[PDB]
Amino acid sequence: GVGTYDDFHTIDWVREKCKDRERHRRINSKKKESAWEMTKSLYDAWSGWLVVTLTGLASGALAGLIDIAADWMTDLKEGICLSALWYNHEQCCWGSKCPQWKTWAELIIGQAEGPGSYIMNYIMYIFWALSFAFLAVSLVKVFAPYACGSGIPEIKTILSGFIIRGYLGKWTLMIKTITLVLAVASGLSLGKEGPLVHVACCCGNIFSYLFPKYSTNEAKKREVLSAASAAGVSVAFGAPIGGVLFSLEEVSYYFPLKTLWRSFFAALVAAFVLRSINPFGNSRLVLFYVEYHTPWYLFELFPFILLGVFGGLWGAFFIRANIAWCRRRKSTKFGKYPVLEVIIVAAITAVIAFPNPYTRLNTSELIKELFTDCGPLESSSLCDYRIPDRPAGVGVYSAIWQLCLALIFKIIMTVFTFGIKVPSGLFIPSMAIGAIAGRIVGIAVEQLAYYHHDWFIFKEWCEVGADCITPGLYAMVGAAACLGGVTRMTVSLVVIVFELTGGLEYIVPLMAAVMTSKWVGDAFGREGIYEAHIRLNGYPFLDAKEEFTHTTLAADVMRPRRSDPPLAVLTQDNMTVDDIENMINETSYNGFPVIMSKESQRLVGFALRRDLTIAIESARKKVCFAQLKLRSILDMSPFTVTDHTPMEIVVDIFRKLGLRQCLVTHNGRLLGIITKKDILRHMA
Amino acid sequence: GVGTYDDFHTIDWVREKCKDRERHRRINSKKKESAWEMTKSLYDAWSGWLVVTLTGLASGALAGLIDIAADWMTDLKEGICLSALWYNHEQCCWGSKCPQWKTWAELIIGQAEGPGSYIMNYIMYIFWALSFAFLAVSLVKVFAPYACGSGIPEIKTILSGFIIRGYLGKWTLMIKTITLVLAVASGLSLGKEGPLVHVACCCGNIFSYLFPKYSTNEAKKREVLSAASAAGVSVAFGAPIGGVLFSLEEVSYYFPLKTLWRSFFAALVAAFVLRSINPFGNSRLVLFYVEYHTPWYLFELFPFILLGVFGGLWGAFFIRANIAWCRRRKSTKFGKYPVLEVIIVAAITAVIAFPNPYTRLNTSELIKELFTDCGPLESSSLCDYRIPDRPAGVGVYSAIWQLCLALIFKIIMTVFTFGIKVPSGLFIPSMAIGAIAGRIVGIAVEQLAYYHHDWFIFKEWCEVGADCITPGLYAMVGAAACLGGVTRMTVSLVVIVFELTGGLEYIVPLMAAVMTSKWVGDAFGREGIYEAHIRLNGYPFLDAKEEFTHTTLAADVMRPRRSDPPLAVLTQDNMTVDDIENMINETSYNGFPVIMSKESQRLVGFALRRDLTIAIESARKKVCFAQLKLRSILDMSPFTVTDHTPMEIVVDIFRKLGLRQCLVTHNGRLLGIITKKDILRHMA
Ligand SMILES: Nc1ncnc2c1ncn2[C@@H]1O[C@H](COP(=O)(O)O)[C@@H](O)[C@H]1O
Ligand SMILES: Nc1ncnc2c1ncn2[C@@H]1O[C@H](COP(=O)(O)O)[C@@H](O)[C@H]1O
């Protein structure tokens, strides 16, 4: 019972490190006594690599299964495959105007064309969208309410030391997997790549419990989960180095500088296991995978910057509009009806996403077609073409018309769709918005070059007889621009994009676009979406970037004040059982310092609520703090800070040593306490 | 005068951070007042990127000039070029049995063959080696005694907070460059890639002084030098990512987690500037550059491990043998004659390195030929060849005979040649030892396959009519094995070997060899060469890996003891000028705590020697610590730690907050102090 942590309170890292040292000393004392002890110590040391290996394996396997099921269910909204009911659209079409794959309209009316067929297909698409959204939201609400959302805002807080009991359990993992598949299939403007960080961390937490070295200790658990988040982003984007950089930058909070190898190994193993999931010989590393072998010119940095500007405004817009909506999702009756919320949102998305062929496609498929340049064989509306460039017809006009509506639709609907009670990600919708913007810009540039190639701006570069601009690169740049504008990631995101879409010729474009998007989004506030949502949920997250603007000291932030009762303290050897029982019943504090005497106020040590209560109960079933005696469980080395200490130092010691509370002493006389809640409240 | 640091002292990072916060507040107060202030603040923020950019530029330029001059003077030992006196051996041989390039023997006797010609060439090679070594060592001894050695053991300490005044000045940089060129040319068993870290850090220190933001502050300077070390390693090996990993792992000690971008940018800029240094169109990224496009088999993983074993023993041997010798270099009259030491060592090296053609070659050229597989046109003794394999004659027997002597010679000489008073590196000689070992193993494997292909072990893999084993791969693996066994680097070294010799097919062999070498070298002690030499020089380096084995508290490490006088302290308002003068004259401490009274021993604050003396001198030219008054320069926030605190916490707070001293308080009563020297001494 002693040394546990209760629900929804932040962790003290120093105590966990001390307990880890105690266990290490216990092991090392026996280590040299016999060879068997050396073998046991080696196994205990390899426990970390075992848990990280299993986390990578599970992340790869679960991401592969999620991708397969999501693809199948997304295709199931548009038709079935009579020859084999367990093949998806692409697999059935490739397995040979196809008679084996039949849409619902052909099944019900028996006619493949006409107003009736379109009506029936529209209705049935709406039906499956509604059914998948219903099943996912209800399953989340009933069996594991923690699966909702991307879960990165919570994983970041958990790695910062926070505690959420079932967030990384087995029911949360199972329901997150199933409901993430169902939600991505439903057609909601959400993703499945951000939520895989939560799945990887769930796997890490589950696999930690197989080793007592990690089950009892918590900081070691945070290290394992930091590796797991790297594995999760790796498997999400297939970018081991990008995943590890994301973990170090966005998610991982505490970094002993040795687990970086563990994070990289976890990412590599996850990517390896995911790559092996290719039963049908797919040629893509990810469902939104594309590569580029075309040039880019210096004048294309003018609009690559412009896209960054877009990525900065939309990002800044999104955090403004989404957070506000999420606010209304809690300060209105809309929050009392989450299943109805998801039903309405999914229905609206399906009704307004079917007419436009770009929004009807799976967002990953949309990102894939937005990264692919127009080939000779392509005759779709996106590449309807009839001099260096190619003449264009009404098809391109209509294509821009449709892409504009797709962009508006997705910008508006991701705002309302991010914070609903079903596993939802933000990487995929943000990339879709950015890619649609980039494709629009690229098509505009291509048409501008074609009509006015005779202008000097293009006369120097564009060569007669060959294509001069590649809109797919513009789309890939806009994806990163918006992704960095919303997440405020700079280098981890750029590495993620580089590994996600192979090719180094576009480091300068991506770098410029991402930097411009972040700098434009910072002019409206330096909050990423995962920090704006951490703020909104009011999670006790000690931001590594937050600055204490007030030029005040630890004097300002102690919270015994003139309007508060006298500081809660403990005497040394005069108090009895009744006094402590009454004080704890009448008070609501997690820990109490121990001092010499009323007139002395000379510090002795620290004690915690849970262990003190446990000891009192044990003593009653079966009071001096000096050398009934509670000497053992008394934290005799509590951190202290002088009132004239400045708040930068207190924040720094909290960040580095992972403090949960620090006493404050004046000339050896105790004054008050400063906990994480105090620093966080006062920082705001 | 207030706030400076004395020579050969250790920086307290917390005070520097507080000063940086004060300056940041000063700037930010004016920042919002006008646009000009915003521009000034933006320039001040860009100061860091400017200094890192200039550090990369200077590292690239200086490494390029050093490489060019080292190549030219290394070739000058063997001949001249009549047509143009400023072209080296390769350039004049390529500029067309060559009549332009003439060796000394043909110039003096006029005959190109015979005993006399060989005698004269041998004598002149010895002469040139002696003269180059003499000039380098004398120039180091006279103009900048700090240029000697690789300088990594000292820079690791400097980035840990230590101060060495002229280590990174302008005379040290100039003399280091010139004498490093001259030493590499001399023919000593040393290198020029480790010392480039010192050149890069010198450049960083020099370029910091151009900005007041970094000149006055020290921790900011430490960040700049951390980036500079990454740039130096990058330019040394042409490996930006490898250089940054080396900086984070080996050299860089304090890591705000934001400068990693600065380190990567510095490395990239250094590599870019170095690559542009190719006036004559050389095809090699580095003078020891080679690439591989051949396979490797699983059975070749046995001796790749074996080389690792070698890399572990030799490494462990070297640190044992070199340190001992370096120890004797201080406990004998040999240390009183450093110029004679270098003369004798260079003379012996030239005398016994000329006869064997493998040791007569520049160690970088030796590493290059050891990395290159035998081509059809090669007729040298290394590849004298007359079934899957190729028949061999007496040439291969003699080649193994010669490579064995080369390995023994290099192993023995690098032991005596590392700690001499002239810029000497250890990457090049260690990689040469490893490459010779790997080439020996590869040739042995190839011959065993040729004679005994009929055995089942090779019958499964080797294909008739084609080569089966590539000794160059074995040499490249052995280089990394020995490099990691001497430096005890695992992942940074592996990335360095990746980027130095392009190709990912060989990750498993390199990783296995490096890990085996480190684990075998750890069985004899977990000290890298740069930590064994830090220990030997007795530098106050707080190792990030050292463990405090004693299960003791902060009480035992207190150094007021029964045999020592009473703790040095100050009274608040009772003492006069005479008392302070006498106490400073009769005592030798850097800082003094301020307490309430003799009978109270209640802490008040902290004071430093230098600023206190400065204030007293100023007061005399033109005594209460309460609210002559010295209130201003009195530190009110000295870190305190209860004696019952355990030493792991003290070590961790020292390593995280960069403490120089921490008081210790007992129930509010001051007891003693714990400085970095105390912890370091007690740790041993
Ligand atoms: N021993 C104590 N005496 C008085 N106030 C306390 C004590 N412990 C905690 N507090 C206050 O109660 C708040 C909530 O406690 P905690 O959950 O420990 O952060 C802290 O932020 C303090 O302001
Ligand atoms: N004011 C002081 N009174 C007594 N010992 C001190 C004081 N300041 C430093 N020391 C000790 O003197 C030794 C050398 O001090 P320093 O070289 O200034 O770190 C260490 O053992 C310190 O703990």
Q: By the 8 A CB rule, do A589 and A609 touch?
A: yes
Coil vs helix vs strand at A282: coil
SS3 string, B71-88, reads: HHHHHHCCCEECCCCCCC
Calculate the CA dihedral of residues A158, A225, A425, A250 and round it to 10 degrees: 70
Pairwise CA distance, residues A580 & A571, whole Å? 10
Q: Alpha-carbon torsion A310, A311, A312, A313, what sign?
A: positive
Coil vs helix vs strand at A440: helix
Query: Measuring CA to CA, how many Å separate B612 from each of A515, B51, B375, B601?
Result: 48, 34, 72, 21
* Cα-Cα end-to-end distance for chain A: 35
Token couple for A166: 């079932």
Calculate the CA dihedral of residues B410, B412, B415, B417 and round it to 10 degrees: -60
Pairwise CA distance, residues A272 & A442, whole Å? 35
Q: Which residues contact A210 (CB under 8 A, 6 or more apart)?
A: A51, A54
Pairwise CA distance, residues A233 & B64, whole Å? 40
Say how far residue B308 (Cα) sits from the centre of its chain.
22
β-pair type (A669-675, A661-666): antiparallel
Q: Which residues contact A78 (CB under 8 A, 6 or more apart)?
A: A89, A103, A104, A121, A125
Q: Alpha-carbon torsion B567, B573, B576, B577, what sign?
A: positive
Give the residue among B168, B140, B174 at the shortest CA–CA distance from B154.
B168
Give the residue among A405, A466, A460 at the shortest CA–CA distance from A436.
A405
Say how far residue B269 (Cα) sits from the centre of its chain.
20
Which residues 204-223 of chain A have a CB within 8 Å of chain B? none
β-pair type (A101-102, B101-102): unpaired
Does residue B649 sit at the A interface (CB-CB below 8 Å)? yes
Coil vs helix vs strand at A451: helix
Chain-chain contact of B668 with A642 (C-beta, under 8 angstroms) = no
Does residue B572 sit at the A interface (CB-CB below 8 Å)? no
Does residue A644 sit at the B interface (CB-CB below 8 Å)? yes
β-pair type (B591-595, B603-608): antiparallel
Minimal C-alpha gap between A219 and chain B (Å): 15
Pairwise CA distance, residues B670 & B595, whole Å? 8
Q: Alpha-carbon torsion B141, B143, B149, B151, what sign?
A: positive
Name the residue of A673, A678, A681 to mutate for ligand 1: max ligand atoms within 8 A of Cβ. Answer: A673
Pairwise CA distance, residues A301 & A297, whole Å? 7
Q: By the 8 A CB rule, do A254 and A222 touch?
A: yes
Give the up-direction half-sphere exposure of residue A314: CA atoms within 13 A in the CB hemisphere: 33
Which residues in chain A have their CB less than 8 angstroms from residue B18's CB?
A: 646, 648-649
Give the up-direction half-sphere exposure of residue B104: CA atoms within 13 A in the CB hemisphere: 16
Pairwise CA distance, residues A168 & A199, whole Å? 8
- CB-nearest partner of B644 from A17, A490, A636: A636
Q: By the 8 A CB rule, do B296 and B505 touch?
A: yes
Q: By the 8 A CB rule, do A184 and A427 touch?
A: no
β-pair type (A640-642, A661-666): parallel
Q: By the 8 A CB rule, do A403 and A436 touch?
A: yes
Pairwise CA distance, residues B250 & B487, whole Å? 9
For this PDB entry, the determination method is cryo-EM
User: Per 3-state DSSP, what percentage of chain A is helix, strand, and coil (rounded to 5)?
Assistant: 60, 5, 35
Ligand positioned closest to the Cα atom of B589: 2
Annotated binding site of B for ATP: 589-591, 675-678
Count of CB atoms within 10 A of residue A400's CB? Answer: 15
- CB-nearest partner of B491 from A261, A636, A641: A261
Q: By the 8 A CB rule, do A252 and A76 touch?
A: no
Interface test with B, best of A245, A625, A642 (most B CBs within 10 A): A642
Query: Measuring CA to CA, how many Å separate A56 from each of A42, A258, A271, B684?
Result: 21, 18, 8, 40
Give ligand 2 pocket residues (Cβ under 6 A): B 559, 567-568, 589-593, 673, 675, 677-678
Residue ranges of alpha helices (H) inside A468-569 are 471-487, 491-500, 507-522, 529-537, 554-557
Name the residue of B558, B588, B673 to mutate for ligand 2: max ligand atoms within 8 A of Cβ. Answer: B673
Q: By the 8 A CB rule, do A548 and A651 touch?
A: yes
Pairwise CA distance, residues B512 & A221, whole Å? 28
Calculate the CA dihedral of residues A483, A484, A487, A489 and round it to 10 degrees: 140
- CB-nearest partner of B657 from A261, A638, A652: A652
N residues, chain A: 684
Minimal C-alpha gap between A635 and chain B (Å): 10
Determine whether B24 is exposed, middle or buried from the number of CB atoms within 10 Å of its CB (0-12, 13-18, 19+).
middle
Residue identified by tokens 């960083």 is B204
Which residues in chain B have their CB less than 8 angstroms from residue A602's CB?
A: 667-668
Residue identified by tokens 């060849």 is B385
Q: By the 8 A CB rule, do A78 and A125 touch?
A: yes
Query: Measuring CA to CA, how many Å separate B654 from each of A90, A249, B260?
Result: 60, 24, 22
Residue identifier of the C-alpha nearest atom 20 of ligand 1:
A675
Token couple for A98: 């196809």
Looking at the DSSP bridge assignments, the partners of residue A664 are: A641, A672
Give the residue among A155, A154, A134, A165 at the shortest CA–CA distance from A422.
A134
| C-alpha B569 – ligand 2 centre gap (Å) | 11
Q: By the 8 A CB rule, do B634 and B607 touch?
A: yes
Does residue B32 sit at the A interface (CB-CB below 8 Å)? no
Q: Which residues contact B330 (CB under 8 A, 6 or more apart)?
A: none
Interface test with A, best of B257, B495, B548 (most A CBs within 10 A): B257
- CB-nearest partner of B21 from A248, A648, A667: A648
Instruction: Please name the amino acid found at residue B169.
Output: G
Query: Measuring CA to CA, how many Å separate A409 from each of A402, A415, A429, B592?
Result: 10, 10, 11, 69
SS3 string, B490-540, reads: CHHHHHHHHHHCCCCCCHHHHHHHHHHHHHHHHCCCCCCHHHHHHHHHCCC
Resolution in units of Å? 3.1
Pairwise CA distance, residues B578 & A471, whole Å? 82
Ligand positioned closest to the Cα atom of A584: 1
Residue identified by tokens 């074995």 is B474
Token couple for B330: 């201080």
**What does residue B553 show for φ and ψ, rounded to 5 degrees?**
-105, -175
Residue identified by tokens 């050229």 is B365
The 8-class DSSP code of residue B250 comes to I
Instruction: Please name the amino acid found at residue B182.
Output: L
Count of CB atoms within 10 A of residue B576's CB? Answer: 9
Pairwise CA distance, residues B587 & B670, whole Å? 19
Coil vs helix vs strand at B279: coil
CB-based burial, A577-598: b 16+ in 10 Å, e otherwise = eeebeeebeeeeeebbbbbbee
Looking at the DSSP bridge assignments, the partners of residue A64 are: none
Give the residue among A275, A209, A341, A291 at the shortest CA–CA distance from A505.
A291
Which residues in chain A have their CB less than 8 angstroms from residue B544's CB?
A: 257
CB-based burial, A239-261: b 16+ in 10 Å, e otherwise = bbbbbbbbbbbbbbbbeeeebbb
Q: By the 8 A CB rule, do B180 and B24 touch?
A: no
Pairwise CA distance, residues A245 & A121, whole Å? 44
User: Which residue of chain B is at minimal alpha-carbon distance from A594?
Assistant: B667
Q: Which residues contact A137 (CB under 8 A, 6 or more apart)?
A: A179, A183, A338, A339, A342, A343, A420, A421, A422
CB pairs under 8 A between A and B: 86
User: Which residue of chain B is at minimal alpha-carbon distance from A13?
Assistant: B649
The 8-class DSSP code of residue A247 comes to I
Instruction: Please name the amino acid found at residue B574.
Output: N
Pairwise CA distance, residues B45 & B42, whole Å? 5
Chain-chain contact of A648 with B17 (C-beta, under 8 angstroms) = yes
Does residue B372 sit at the A interface (CB-CB below 8 Å)? no
Which residues in chain B have their CB less than 8 angstroms from residue A257's CB?
A: 248-249, 255, 544
Determine whether B575 is exposed, middle or buried from the number of CB atoms within 10 Å of its CB (0-12, 13-18, 19+).
middle
Q: By the 8 A CB rule, do B388 and B466 touch?
A: yes
Which residues in chain B have their CB less than 8 angstroms from residue A544's CB?
A: 257
Query: Measuring CA to CA, how many Å separate A84 from each of A89, A99, A304, B218?
Result: 11, 12, 46, 71
Does residue B668 sit at the A interface (CB-CB below 8 Å)? yes
Coil vs helix vs strand at A333: helix
Give ligand 1 pocket residues (Cβ under 6 A): A 559, 567-568, 589-593, 661, 673, 675, 677-678
Residues in chain B whose C lies over 2.5 Å from the next residue's N (breaks after): 96, 386, 622, 627
Query: Measuring CA to CA, how many Å separate B130 from each of B137, B307, B379?
Result: 11, 35, 32
Q: Which residues contact B398 (CB under 8 A, 6 or more apart)?
A: B381, B384
Chain-chain contact of B603 with A640 (C-beta, under 8 angstroms) = no
Q: What is the DSSP string of B213-244?
A: HHHS-SHHHHHHHHHHHHHHHHHHHT-HHHHH
**Longest distance between any two alpha carbons in chain A, whole Å:** 97
Query: Measuring CA to CA, how many Å separate A507 from each of A482, A493, A514, B265?
Result: 16, 12, 10, 13
Calculate the CA dihedral of residues B166, B167, B168, B170 and round it to 10 degrees: 50
Residue ranges of alpha helices (H) inside B587-630 are 609-621
Query: Measuring CA to CA, how many Å separate A349 from each of A405, A428, B281, B482?
Result: 13, 16, 61, 62
Give the number of the atom of ligand 2 that is nearest the alpha carbon of residue B673: 23
Give the residue among A388, A371, A369, A364 at the shortest CA–CA distance from A474.
A371
Annotated binding site of B: 150, 427, 530, 589-591, 675-678
The 8-class DSSP code of residue A67 comes to H
- CB-nearest partner of A644 from B602, B636, B649: B636
User: Which residue of chain B is at minimal alpha-carbon distance from A260?
Assistant: B491
Determine which helix (DSSP H) or strand (DSSP E) holds A10, and give its type and residue range. Answer: none
Q: Which residues contact A142 (CB under 8 A, 6 or more apart)?
A: none
Give the residue among A282, A185, A265, A193 at the shortest CA–CA distance from A228.
A265
User: Per 3-state DSSP, what percentage of chain B is helix, strand, and coil (rounded to 5)?
Assistant: 60, 5, 35
